Design a protein around this ligand. Structure first.
Ligand SMILES: NC(=O)C1=CN([C@@H]2O[C@H](COP(=O)(O)OP(=O)(O)OC[C@H]3O[C@@H](n4cnc5c(N)ncnc54)[C@H](OP(=O)(O)O)[C@@H]3O)[C@@H](O)[C@H]2O)C=CC1
Ligand SMILES: COc1cc(Cc2cnc(N)nc2N)cc(OC)c1OC
Ligand SMILES: [Cl-]
Length: 159
């Protein structure tokens, strides 16, 4: 099983200048929950965004160029990433825009955080047909002192 987990603003925005254009600790909490003790495949742009290994997960970076951090696994292809995760129950693909593009066709599950924010963005979740997917579970949260936007955590499964 391959799964994508991603936070989407109003216009499927996921990124602005190699950062998420919002601050939702409640999202980073939901991200940690569903990825922990599973392998994560991220693109080199996302690695640099996070800027440190994600504890309690084998970290797998996609980069044509050679590695620059001895604490994480590096791979130069999609097939190498996928192989690098090994015989596991679930592979979590955690960004960014170009990695999502490549993995979404392969993906069985979506872990979507829908954020009530119309924010300028250089990077968007790839398009898809909701025809192709069926809503499994969702959870709505109001904005609060720490999370300036309302948000909905959704899970979808292929057919
Ligand atoms: N909203 C959300 O849920 C999330 C937000 N983001 C946002 O996403 C943005 C980053 O997305 P984007 O700019 O598309 O980049 P990525 O984060 O997908 O990383 C791009 C890099 O990945 C490497 N790469 C990708 N595919 C391959 C491949 N098949 N073989 C080899 N290397 C590969 C390349 O590295 P190289 O240059 O070494 O060749 C490429 O330059 C940021 O703004 C970030 O904030 C990211 C995570 C989640
Ligand atoms: C743990 O912090 C980060 C996590 C992510 C990936 C990510 C974040 N949120 C969700 N819902 N899905 C994801 N795949 C991306 C990040 O930066 C772009 C992070 O830095 C704050
Ligand atoms: Cl690419």
């Amino acid at each position: 099983m391959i799964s994508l987990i991603a936070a989407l603003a109003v216009d499927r925005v996921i990124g602005m200048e190699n950062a998420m254009p919002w601050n939702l600790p409640a999202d980073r909490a939901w991200f940690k929950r569903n990825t922990l003790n599973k392998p994560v495949i991220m693109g080199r742009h996302t690695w640099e965004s996070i800027g440190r290994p994600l504890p309690g997960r084998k970290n797998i970076i996609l980069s044509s160029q050679p590695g620059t951090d001895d604490r994480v696994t590096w791979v130069k292809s999609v097939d190498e990433a996928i192989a690098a995760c090994g015989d596991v129950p679930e592979i979590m693909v955690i960004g960014g825009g170009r990695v999502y593009e490549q993995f979404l066709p392969k993906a069985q599950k979506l872990y979507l955080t829908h954020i009530d924010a119309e924010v300028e963005g250089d990077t968007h979740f790839p398009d898809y047909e909701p025809d192709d997917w069926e809503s499994v579970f969702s959870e709505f949260h109001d904005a609060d002192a720490q999370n300036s936007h309302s948000y909905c955590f959704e899970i979808l499964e292929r057919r």
